[PDB]
Structures are given as structure tokens and as C-alpha cells.
A paper describes a structure:
Aromatic residues cluster in the core of folded proteins, where they stabilize the structure through multiple interactions. NMR studies in the 1970s demonstrated that aromatic side chains can undergo ring flips—that is, 180° rotations of the χ2 dihedral angle (Cβ–Cγ axis)—even when engaged in stabilizing interactions in the hydrophobic core. Here we capture ring flipping events of a buried tyrosine residue in the [name] domain of the [name] ([name]). Our data therefore suggest that the conformation of the aromatic ring at position 526 is determined by steric interactions dictated by the size of the surrounding amino acids.
The data confirm that exchange contributions to the transverse relaxation are present for residues within three regions of the protein. These residues are located spatially close to tyrosine 526 (Y526). A mutation of Y526 to alanine ([name]) shows no conformational exchange, and conserves the protein backbone conformation, as evidenced from its crystal structure that we obtained at 1.5-Å resolution. These results show that the relaxation dispersion that affects around 40% of the residues in the [name] domain arises from a single exchange process, with Y526 being the origin of the observed exchange.
Numbering used by the authors:
A (entry chain AAA): 487 to 549
B (entry chain BBB): 489 to 549
The structure:
Amino acid sequence: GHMEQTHRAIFRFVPRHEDELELEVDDPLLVELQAEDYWAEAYNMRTGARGVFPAYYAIEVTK
Amino acid sequence: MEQTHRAIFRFVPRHEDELELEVDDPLLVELQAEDYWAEAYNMRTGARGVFPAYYAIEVTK
């Protein structure tokens, strides 16, 4: 099928590290993995970037 | 050295520079950096490092 948004970013996140996913508030995200260390692995549907971010920076949207 | 902040979310480092947080951890924040990372001392663990800034709230002075 198609890429479906799973989450929305609610806080700004600016990477310090090469594996991180930059977030702006309101970014639509497709979260691929919620890791046990409370990082999320995702595709940012605004930028097309992929990476990890601190998991409490996004809320689930389930249309 | 008195508490400035309280952790509100669990944060487990992936990176060398990061500060581990448990919920309710007392923090002394030295810098709120312009890239939305906080630079702090965890007053429970005695560790120093950085964490994503919205993981801590200011305490009632």
C-alpha cells in the first residue's frame, strides 16, 4: 500500500548525533520501532529523513 | 549546588555525552543550549551530561 503516519512530533529536537532524526513541532512521523531504551526509530514525513529520537517527543495518532 | 529542574520522562543514553534520567530525578541544569539540549548534573546519580530539554521542568523556587 502506502506510508501511513503513526505519530506527530510535539517538541523540537535538533540532533547532536548522526543517528538522530530532526523534529519540528507538528512533524508527521512514521514510527518503525519503539526501542526498549525509550528511543523511537522513525521516518519524518515532512523531511524524508530517518533516524532516532527521544520517544516522549511524539504522540500516537491512530486514524 | 541546589536543584533547578526535575526530570519528567525516562531517558536512557545511546551516546557518550548523555545524562541518564529517571522520572522525578533532581537536576542542576548548567545550560539550556540553543539546540534544545540541556546540560546538567543529576543530583541523584552524580553524573553530568546532556539530555533533550523538554524532559525536565523547573522546580518551585
